[PDB]
Amino acid sequence: NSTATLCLGHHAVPNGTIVKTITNDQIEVTNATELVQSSSTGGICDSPHQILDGENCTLIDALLGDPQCDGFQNKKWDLFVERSKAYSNCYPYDVPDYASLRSLVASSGTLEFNNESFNWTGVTQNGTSSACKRKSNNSFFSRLNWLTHLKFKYPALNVTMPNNEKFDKLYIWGVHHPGTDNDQIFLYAQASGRITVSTKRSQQTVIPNIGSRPRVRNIPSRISIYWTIVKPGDILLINSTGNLIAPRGYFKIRSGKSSIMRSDAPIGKCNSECITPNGSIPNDKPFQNVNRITYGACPRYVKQNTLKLATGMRNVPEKQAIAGFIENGWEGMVDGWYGFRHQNSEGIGQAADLKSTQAAINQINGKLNRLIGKTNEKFHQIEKEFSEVEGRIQDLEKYVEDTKIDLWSYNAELLVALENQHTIDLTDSEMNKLFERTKKQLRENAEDMGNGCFKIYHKCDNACIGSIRNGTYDHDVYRDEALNNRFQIK
Amino acid sequence: NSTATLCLGHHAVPNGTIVKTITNDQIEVTNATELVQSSSTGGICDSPHQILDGENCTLIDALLGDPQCDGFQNKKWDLFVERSKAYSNCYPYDVPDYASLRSLVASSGTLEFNNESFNWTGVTQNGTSSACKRKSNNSFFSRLNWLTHLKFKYPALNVTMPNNEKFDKLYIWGVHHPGTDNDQIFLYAQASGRITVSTKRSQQTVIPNIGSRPRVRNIPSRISIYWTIVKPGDILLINSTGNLIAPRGYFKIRSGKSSIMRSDAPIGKCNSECITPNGSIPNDKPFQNVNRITYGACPRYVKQNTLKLATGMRNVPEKQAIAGFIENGWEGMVDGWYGFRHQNSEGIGQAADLKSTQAAINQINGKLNRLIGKTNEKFHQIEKEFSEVEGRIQDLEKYVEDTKIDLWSYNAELLVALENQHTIDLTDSEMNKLFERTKKQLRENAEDMGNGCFKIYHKCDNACIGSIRNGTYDHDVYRDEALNNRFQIK
Amino acid sequence: NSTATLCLGHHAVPNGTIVKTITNDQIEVTNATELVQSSSTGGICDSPHQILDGENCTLIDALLGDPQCDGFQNKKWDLFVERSKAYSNCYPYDVPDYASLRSLVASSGTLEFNNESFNWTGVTQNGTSSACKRKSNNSFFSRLNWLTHLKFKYPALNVTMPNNEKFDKLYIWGVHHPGTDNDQIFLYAQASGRITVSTKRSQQTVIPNIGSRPRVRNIPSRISIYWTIVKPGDILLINSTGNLIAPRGYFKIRSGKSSIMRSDAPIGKCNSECITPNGSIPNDKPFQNVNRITYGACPRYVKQNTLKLATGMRNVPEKQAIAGFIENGWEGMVDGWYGFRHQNSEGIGQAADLKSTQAAINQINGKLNRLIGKTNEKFHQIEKEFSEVEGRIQDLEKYVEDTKIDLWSYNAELLVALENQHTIDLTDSEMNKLFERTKKQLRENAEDMGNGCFKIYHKCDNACIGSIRNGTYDHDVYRDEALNNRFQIK
Numbered sequence A, B, C: 001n002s003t004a005t006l007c008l009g010h011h012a013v014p015n016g017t018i019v020k021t022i023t024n025d026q027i028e029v030t031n032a033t034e035l036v037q038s039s040s041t042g043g044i045c046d047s048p049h050q051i052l053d054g055e056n057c058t059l060i061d062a063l064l065g066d067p068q069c070d071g072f073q074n075k076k077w078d079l080f081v082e083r084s085k086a087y088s089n090c091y092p093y094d095v096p097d098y099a100s101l102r103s104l105v106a107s108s109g110t111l112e113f114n115n116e117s118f119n120w121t122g123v124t125q126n127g128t129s130s131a132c133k134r135k136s137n138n139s140f141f142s143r144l145n146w147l148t149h150l151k152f153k154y155p156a157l158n159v160t161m162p163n164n165e166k167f168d169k170l171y172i173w174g175v176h177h178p179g180t181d182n183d184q185i186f187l188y189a190q191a192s193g194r195i196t197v198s199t200k201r202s203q204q205t206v207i208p209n210i211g212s213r214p215r216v217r218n219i220p221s222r223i224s225i226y227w228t229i230v231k232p233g234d235i236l237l238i239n240s241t242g243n244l245i246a247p248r249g250y251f252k253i254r255s256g257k258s259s260i261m262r263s264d265a266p267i268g269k270c271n272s273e274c275i276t277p278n279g280s281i282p283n284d285k286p287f288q289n290v291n292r293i294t295y296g297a298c299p300r301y302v303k304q305n306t307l308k309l310a311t312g313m314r315n316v317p318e319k320q321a322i323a324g325f326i327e328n329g330w331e332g333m334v335d336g337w338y339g340f341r342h343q344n345s346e347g348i349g350q351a352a353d354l355k356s357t358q359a360a361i362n363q364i365n366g367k368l369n370r371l372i373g374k375t376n377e378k379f380h381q382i383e384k385e386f387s388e389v390e391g392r393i394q395d396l397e398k399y400v401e402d403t404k405i406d407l408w409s410y411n412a413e414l415l416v417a418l419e420n421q422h423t424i425d426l427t428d429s430e431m432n433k434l435f436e437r438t439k440k441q442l443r444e445n446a447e448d449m450g451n452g453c454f455k456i457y458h459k460c461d462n463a464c465i466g467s468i469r470n471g472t473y474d475h476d477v478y479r480d481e482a483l484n485n486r487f488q489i490k
């Protein structure tokens, strides 16, 4: 007796987790948290973004006014969702640069349409087809006007529509390509000639081309769709002698945050900021491996399926007399991260050190706050999956996205390694600081035993040990006793 | 008496600045410097890049030779500046793929034009229009030759121009689209037919299309502009029966560092390496938030409006007997960053430690030198602002630039946090090293009081203290005295 | 006598290497390794990727079936290598969107072709030209069928080919543009009319255009090449009255990892994973400055020509009595990185410390293992060099690649600086840890002399010194002797 022991230590847990640092590929820590979101519910939540489920209609079918899409008239969206089951059920058509028209309508986010009174003096309006039935009757695209001859005449059309509004107008129109010369004459009363649609700033001339194409819904003819945007103070001029599928008015074109996504995920009554084709995903984590296609406030796509961020210190087994932190953790330390164990006249005890514990916890929570719940919003982007082979432009779209993903995946990998190294360093540092402060209090009254413990060379009862732990130990009170015990001749 | 005190310390300032590190969102340091350039003068400096102010002319108007652009003939530039007020004042035209022709001329950086003698036997040359007045007379684009019938004949043209030069030739030509069939006959004496312009490696066939477009400067006709590059040893062949707006020669096409920028900033007589649409900006800082559009040696565009780099240590208030660096800075320390305070027989004093101060300053200046004045040059890039809706290609251009900016903004954020953490570490380290070296000199003659000070257990006058500070203190001289004082029984 | 000295130290080498850290632009370390691959052998190794050397043929010439390319029929590749000497030797042709057709065939990786029996009732098949000789006879592209009139009739063709297969079909076809009206009549017996090639999902109409182009291999006519992909359950329909260069069947179109590269490097019998235009390169290093164009498992392209990664500690000259690590390295320490030197009754000695040496070496090898031999594979990408001026799309392709390279170059620069700082820190740390452990063993029996050495205040013979070095020194055995020597009055 006449001496006491005081050990400094830190906790350890039975169920640690492996993380990666700069120093170590694999190091066990007491706790970690996942930074890559890897699952979705599988449903797209209908809140807080305005979702429009296309059901059997593509956006372009909804635009033109396919009868099955009549329910979509004038609707708006943040996200238009196109289904793989979607199919057209009207006159067969193509759109040169379909992808662009789809994109610009998607981004505009509205199907608002304003009817206008075009002067079609001299032709028959409202042509119909058995290939486009509406309520069991022969019909046509709602937003288009199939003009045909009147009394076997089709006068040369030269029709104007000024934009006297403060906003832009989007006009959608078409050219009919009849399957045969018989159809050409039956419909327009004369041989086919070019169609020219112009403004002060633009001109588009299109040549109708007679001929059979493979029948689609029993139709060998085609309609080719074109568009023209007309600015305030400009004028639409339409010049034709036949084959014109005419506009009935204009679409409003807006700018904002709207987009389109291909998905078969069901739409749920729930609330989630981040939408992917697989369904909505939580956006607490900074990264995700669910889908490169996203809409809203979303984690960034990375290639990794897991990245673990340390949220506690190195986890060190307890060695099997009391002993301190040197190659030794304390599994019995459960009310703190760092603490003291002592042996004195009155027994062997343990107490947590609150200051050091809280300093480590605060710093860890600091970095969690920078990384958790901090995702940023993206809206209309580029397409990232393709159903047809196209070459150059598609090669570029793919390479852009590959490039981006690899750079983010590298950033994620480095960030987590750096953060984890910093966490191991800051938690190791709190242990070292606690030891050093204790060493300083004890002055000449103790010696360092090399194992994270001090040999205190005087009687140091429970109150004395408490004084060291609360930082009120007065070394002068004990120095005489201690020096005599230390520097005695044995 | 019979003892002295020696404290180690570091400076502190009354007006510190907040920075971000890896450890802390907000930590006050003694000084910092801004790494994001956020202002411009508002003028584009005319030095050291060769600036060409388009004034009322676009590059394309200057190319074709609109009369108001006659002053631009044969000029070169590093940067062509196009003004929002620019307007065309000649025959109305369009350019299929205007953006590409604009880009390739801009990048070439020259309007040098070499006249050639084309053999236009059988037609009238030099047609003019009241829509394109030059010096009050009817005229036309300077670089183009409006051919019309001769004696009411327009023979089929089949005209050749070999490239026997060592460099490439850029040919600009056009097709006239008359407003009516009357104009077609009045000008070319016959019905319109295709124009074919070919080389050994290329062919472009264009169909003139008669019809009224909305009048522009009272003209319902149009000219569509095309271009053809002809290689050394190749040959231009022009084949037409009318409607040909012919070239008068070729433009030199160069390769180099030239570009074009849309800006309304006035041009100043001043010198600045980095140009943005907002005006020139200083390029000392590594980052900038003025404009994503830049030309020359420019900071990189980031989203942040400020990033502060620490250029001094943690700023710690002085606690209100002398005391050392432990939770305590020295506001009275003004001739150094680190130093010594002492109490002895002769009073209380302070002296700066030059070595430690200079070590910290040098390292900080080291990192300033890597980051300040080190910008790199970019020249012709992609467009980043768009006046029309286009869909797919524009979506890709935008996404490429968004992607780039977010990656750089992340790099900037991480770099500054890392550098700041390193600065806090290196400045803390110089303090700790100074304490340790002093501790080592004193040997058994002093004890650490826990507050950044030593209790020296012998009389230590001003010269003795100086000896410790200059590193020449001989502990053996004082050991006997010191040991007696330390290990006395009180 | 009655004392001993024990110094802790670390090795130093006569031939150190300069590296960059976060702290220092230039710091000498004992060893480093290069992370940028800067040379190639200059040959493309024929293993392990399937190489197809185009020799005198482009891919497109091999596709169409130019006679000099007959050897390529039905071949597959991972990498098709196109030579700058390649030239066409058949009928002159162009391909609108040549780059896309080249890319999609390259990416598909196969020239497998399946003949089909088209019903060409009413025309002459197998037209030939003296411009396309095969085995000295007039011939034509192997995969194309030049149809001409039969008995001075050319009936309107309306020919079908269903896809009843489970895979897609790629059809290549053409339109002949005769030099004169005489040739048109001689070949097709009538005036030229449009050609329409259609499916259920697509239509392409092309207008043959009569006229002389500059003679190529004495031919003023041209063939323009087009392609059509036909899906399972779809049907190809060809509709023409002349000028049709017909398909003889279809190409298989596959998806996989194939690509094309322009290179003049000879092909060698050797094995290398990474191919560049300059030749194959080793892929041990994480970065390379040989070529931005790569195929296979390749280091990432960066702008730097060298980045040195530290693989040893700071290299410190030996100062010219034994001395420890403080501003002092040990050039005579050759069997370890860290160790002990001593002076005692029995002489002066040196021994390496294995634990500390191995801890540093292991960590360094750890980071080498993460960076060396870990390259990732890329296959078909975008083009990165261009022989013609094109404007907008090329500007984007270039900017995408510039952007990527600058971001990777920054990542490389930062990574190496960070790693090197960490290596200096971990090697410095092993030295400091060894000193501290020794200090702890010695307890009150030694004093720190400030130069990396302890003065041990008792007789400490070779076995005693060994006990300290193996960590079995019992301080209690010597304490009485040591305390008497330390705290004597001199």
Ligand SMILES: *[C@@H]1O[C@H](CO)[C@@H](O[C@@H]2O[C@H](CO)[C@@H](O[C@H]3O[C@H](CO)[C@@H](O)[C@H](O)[C@@H]3O)[C@H](O)[C@H]2NC(C)=O)[C@H](O)[C@H]1NC(C)=O
Pocket: A179, A180, A212, A213, A214, A215, A218, A220, C158, C159, C160, C235
């Ligand atoms: C050019 O060739 C085409 C393909 O051979 C051909 O299309 C085919 O036309 C037939 C005849 O009408 C269609 O067959 C239909 O026959 C009866 C007619 O009463 C219908 O009741 C059936 O529904 C049956 O389908 C084919 O469907 C059609 N084939 C394709 C692939 O579309 C064109 O008619 C030809 N064009 C010309 C101008 O001759």
Ligand SMILES: *[C@@H]1O[C@H](CO)[C@@H](O[C@@H]2O[C@H](CO)[C@@H](O[C@H]3O[C@H](CO)[C@@H](O)[C@H](O)[C@@H]3O)[C@H](O)[C@H]2NC(C)=O)[C@H](O)[C@H]1NC(C)=O
Pocket: A158, A159, A160, A235, B179, B180, B212, B213, B214, B215, B218, B220
């Ligand atoms: C097809 O329709 C066009 C638009 O309605 C029409 O253009 C318009 O033509 C008129 C008549 O020339 C122009 O009006 C001008 O009238 C007198 C004529 O002496 C002039 O002095 C005035 O300057 C006045 O502007 C319109 O300017 C013009 N409108 C537009 C929008 O360009 C075409 O003429 C029609 N084309 C055909 C072939 O009939």
Ligand SMILES: *[C@@H]1O[C@H](CO)[C@@H](O[C@@H]2O[C@H](CO)[C@@H](O[C@H]3O[C@H](CO)[C@@H](O)[C@H](O)[C@@H]3O)[C@H](O)[C@H]2NC(C)=O)[C@H](O)[C@H]1NC(C)=O
Pocket: B158, B159, B160, B235, C179, C180, C212, C213, C214, C215, C218, C220
């Ligand atoms: C339109 O102009 C073209 C260029 O002037 C012209 O092409 C040239 O045609 C001549 C005549 O055939 C070729 O010259 C050849 O002359 C003899 C004919 O026996 C040959 O043996 C020689 O090989 C010699 O080359 C030129 O080669 C050719 N020039 C070019 C650049 O192709 C067209 O013929 C003209 N077209 C029309 C319809 O008149």
Ligand SMILES: *[C@@H]1O[C@H](CO)[C@@H](O[C@@H]2O[C@H](CO)[C@@H](O)[C@H](O)[C@H]2NC(C)=O)[C@H](O)[C@H]1NC(C)=O
Pocket: A156, A157, A158, A193, A194, A195, A196, A239, A240, A241, B180, B181, B210, B211, B212
């Ligand atoms: C554009 O409209 C004008 C009429 O304003 C058309 O010109 C007329 O065409 C008819 C029949 O082709 C001719 O008989 C008339 O002589 C023309 N009138 C005038 C005033 O020139 C013109 O054809 C239309 N263009 C197109 C491509 O359909």
Ligand SMILES: *[C@@H]1O[C@H](CO)[C@@H](O[C@@H]2O[C@H](CO)[C@@H](O)[C@H](O)[C@H]2NC(C)=O)[C@H](O)[C@H]1NC(C)=O
Pocket: B156, B157, B158, B193, B194, B195, B196, B239, B240, B241, C180, C181, C210, C211, C212
């Ligand atoms: C290209 O030039 C040739 C003349 O070298 C044109 O061919 C002549 O065209 C006229 C009028 O159309 C005919 O009467 C002659 O018989 C043609 N001459 C020959 C030698 O064929 C040809 O039309 C021009 N092509 C174009 C598109 O304008």
Ligand SMILES: *[C@@H]1O[C@H](CO)[C@@H](O[C@@H]2O[C@H](CO)[C@@H](O)[C@H](O)[C@H]2NC(C)=O)[C@H](O)[C@H]1NC(C)=O
Pocket: A180, A181, A210, A211, A212, C156, C157, C158, C193, C194, C195, C196, C239, C240, C241
């Ligand atoms: C596509 O094929 C059809 C035949 O199936 C062509 O139509 C015939 O064309 C000839 C000559 O031009 C006419 O005499 C016949 O009256 C047409 N037959 C029918 C049934 O209409 C048609 O011309 C072809 N199209 C093209 C562009 O070549």
Ligand SMILES: *[C@@H]1O[C@H](CO)[C@@H](O)[C@H](O)[C@H]1NC(C)=O
Pocket: A031, A032, A033, A311, A368
């Ligand atoms: C582990 O870390 C996370 C994030 O700080 C925390 O929410 C969780 O409660 C911790 N788990 C344990 C067992 O401490």
Ligand SMILES: *[C@@H]1O[C@H](CO)[C@@H](O)[C@H](O)[C@H]1NC(C)=O
Pocket: A055, A056, A068
């Ligand atoms: C979509 O089409 C399918 C199959 O034709 C049909 O059964 C279903 O009811 C349609 N859904 C809607 C909303 O019209």
Ligand SMILES: *[C@@H]1O[C@H](CO)[C@@H](O)[C@H](O)[C@H]1NC(C)=O
Pocket: A119, A121
């Ligand atoms: C409609 O067009 C014709 C031109 O053919 C014109 O004469 C008529 O007045 C127009 N009707 C209007 C403007 O109501």
Ligand SMILES: *[C@@H]1O[C@H](CO)[C@@H](O)[C@H](O)[C@H]1NC(C)=O
Pocket: A125, A126
């Ligand atoms: C065309 O149809 C619409 C109803 O869809 C009708 O309001 C309009 O009067 C019709 N016009 C003519 C000329 O039949």
Ligand SMILES: *[C@@H]1O[C@H](CO)[C@@H](O)[C@H](O)[C@H]1NC(C)=O
Pocket: A038, A039, A040, A277, A278, A289, A290, A291
């Ligand atoms: C998301 O869907 C894609 C296909 O679009 C699939 O590759 C991926 O595995 C999905 N991820 C899930 C369901 O977690």
Ligand SMILES: *[C@@H]1O[C@H](CO)[C@@H](O)[C@H](O)[C@H]1NC(C)=O
Pocket: A462, A463, A466, A467, A470, A472
């Ligand atoms: C603080 O110190 C007192 C005596 O100074 C000691 O008895 C006690 O254990 C310490 N802690 C608390 C919470 O009172």
Ligand SMILES: *[C@@H]1O[C@H](CO)[C@@H](O)[C@H](O)[C@H]1NC(C)=O
Pocket: B031, B032, B033, B311, B368
């Ligand atoms: C703060 O730091 C900058 C950059 O080193 C320096 O130029 C400036 O003089 C410093 N300011 C003060 C008050 O020390």
Ligand SMILES: *[C@@H]1O[C@H](CO)[C@@H](O)[C@H](O)[C@H]1NC(C)=O
Pocket: B055, B056, B068
């Ligand atoms: C540009 O045009 C404006 C308005 O027409 C004119 O006042 C001004 O003088 C022009 N500037 C030049 C340099 O021609």
Ligand SMILES: *[C@@H]1O[C@H](CO)[C@@H](O)[C@H](O)[C@H]1NC(C)=O
Pocket: B119, B121
């Ligand atoms: C110009 O062109 C005609 C072809 O119509 C030719 O006959 C004449 O010789 C040419 N003049 C020259 C080459 O000076």
Ligand SMILES: *[C@@H]1O[C@H](CO)[C@@H](O)[C@H](O)[C@H]1NC(C)=O
Pocket: B125, B126
């Ligand atoms: C055409 O105009 C230019 C002056 O701009 C003149 O040099 C040339 O001789 C003219 N040619 C003819 C045929 O009038």
